[PDB]
């Protein structure tokens, strides 16, 4: 996260973090949304232009967590994969389009004062809030500049932005299972995600019932926090009919 | 970096 | 896990479920055309 500041203990008690075995790394950011279910953005897992395909075997979550290299002894847990679920279209080749995995844990984990899973928006939430100019929050250990990294878990508050704006900032083609966030150069506040901060959540604060949603999931960004340029998201309730029918399918 | 998790959770 | 979440899904233990508000949250809700 860049231009972000240190989280605060119980923050964001649904972030969790995707850890490599060997060698033991922080691979993405990833969310608690029940017990037994994690979501996280599918190049996380799979991108073949740098051949990366992660199995069940290779990866460990870890929730509960502040700090990033320390292994918060009674704090934070730690658990194994059952099954990995990538979207039938997530689309590597061209724009990372439907960028979203689903992880089944072996086993449910605990709720506690530092676990807690987030709500995943219905058509009347993400309806009101996903508008351009409303503030969202993205947290991660992921870089703090493009080109060290955090002790701690960051948090920065974006604003959304207008598509078209989105669209004429990159040569890239947005779909609408997308949206971007992020301050204008014209709005002298900074912010971004960056490497390290993919497949972690963006969320916000329904000023209805006071519940927190996850409504996109870190996916992609040209540089981190550059002028000009934005952060893009998967538009989670876009892949919502998707995300239904994985967990009760399995 | 990271310190060390317990071997319980690699097997 | 599905719409609206899980169920007690989004109220933090330390912070709503407490009626304690972390420092930034203000932000968010004071974009939203301001909240309350
Ligand atoms: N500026 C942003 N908004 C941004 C957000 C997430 C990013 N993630 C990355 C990223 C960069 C290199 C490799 C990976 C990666 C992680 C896991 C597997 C494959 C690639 C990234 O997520 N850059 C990112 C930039
Ligand atoms: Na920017």
Known sequence: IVEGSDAEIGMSPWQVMLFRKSPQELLCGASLISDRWVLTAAHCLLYPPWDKNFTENDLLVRIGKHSRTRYERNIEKISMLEKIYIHPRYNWRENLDRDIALMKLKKPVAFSDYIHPVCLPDRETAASLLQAGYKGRVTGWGNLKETGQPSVLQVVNLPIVERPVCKDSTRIRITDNMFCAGYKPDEGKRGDACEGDSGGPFVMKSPFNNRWYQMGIVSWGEGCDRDGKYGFYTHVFRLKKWIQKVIDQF | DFEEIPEEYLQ | ?36
């Open chain 3, 1 to 36: 896990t599905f719409g609206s979440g899980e169920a007690d899904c989004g109220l933090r233990p330390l912070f709503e479920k407490k009626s304690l508000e972390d420092k930034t949250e203000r932000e968010l809700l004071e974009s939203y055309i301001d909240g309350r």
